[PDB]
Structures are given as structure tokens and as C-alpha cells.
Amino acid sequence: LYFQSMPEGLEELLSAPPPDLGAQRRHGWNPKDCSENIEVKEGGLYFERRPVAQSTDGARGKRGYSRGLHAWEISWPLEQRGTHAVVGVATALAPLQTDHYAALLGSNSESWGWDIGRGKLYHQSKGPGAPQYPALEVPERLLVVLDMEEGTLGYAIGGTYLGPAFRGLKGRTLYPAVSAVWGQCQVRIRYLGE
């Protein structure tokens, strides 16, 4: 119902055997670049957000991408999402903590996020008038697809690529990112390439 053609190279990335844990750690969550309320585990494979009231808490991947095709799986349990679970990318300067529950990722000019609970897209957005994407229940696993040749961020679920959610990203250096509100949530990142 919503499928779109994939960017060149993505099929091959998805067909390859899963990456070893070492490769996953290298592009995984950065313990040196996350909310003080987040603990990065297993060398970057996942993080756990501590239970902290009235806080939204984000993490960036260790590596920022400015060219080529980049794709990673996010695994984010359904029962650990709460009011605001947002998946996307961030510049190195996006804020990773705020003192209330919100879609922190995508609330400023430094970040772009898909709210996986409500389906809305956030960039420089507090929520009102946020477009729906695709224009669907998001399962535990989603694929994040950052094409820095064309300057797009989009997503796939259940084998179906949904096309760009955000365009016009050319020239930036962008990091894997989420923002989370749920006490003791655990969010996994599995980088596939390139």
C-alpha cells in the first residue's frame, strides 16, 4: 500500500549477512554523546534510559555521515515507548535532554525525527501541524535510511521502504538519533552500512 523504490545500494545492504557485533559497536550509541540519564550498554549495541520523571532523553550514534548511503535497524519494544518515542537523525549540536515529556528529536533546527507512536514528522516542530508519514503501526524493528547522496532520511518497516520523510539534507553531517521518555526503555541500534 505504501511501498516506494529504494535508493541504489539499499537492497544489497539488506541482503548481506548481519554485521558482526564489532561493526555494530563502531557505529552504535555513543556513551560520550548521550543524555546524562542514559546508559549505553555492550559498547554501543543498545542504551537504557534511567527512570527519571519529567525528562526527555536522547542519544547520538558515534559516527556522523555526510556522503553515501547509511542504514541502521532500530529495535524499540512496543511497551517501552511511552508518550514520545522519536527516531531519526541529529547534527552534532542537537540538545539531548529537556525537562519535560516531548518530541525532543525534531523540536529544533538541529534534528529530524519520526514519532513512531503517532506517525508524525518533526523538524523545527513542537507538534502542531506536523505531517503524517507515510502520507501504520510501527513494529518493534524499523529501518532508518539516510541517503547523503540525495539528502534524504526515510524508513522501512516489515520489508516495505516508505521513501523519504525528510529531504534537502545534502551538505550536512548527520548522526543516528532517538529521543525517549520511558523509564528503563532499552533501544537497540544495528548499523548495516555503508
Binding site: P51, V52, A53, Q54, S55, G82, T83, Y101, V181, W182
Partner: peptide
């Protein structure tokens, strides 16, 4: 007891 977001 925890709040709406398990905090």
C-alpha cells in the same frame, strides 16, 4: 508508583 512514562 510510577507516572505515565514509567518514571
Amino acid at each position: 508508583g510510577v507516572d505515565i512514562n514509567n518514571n
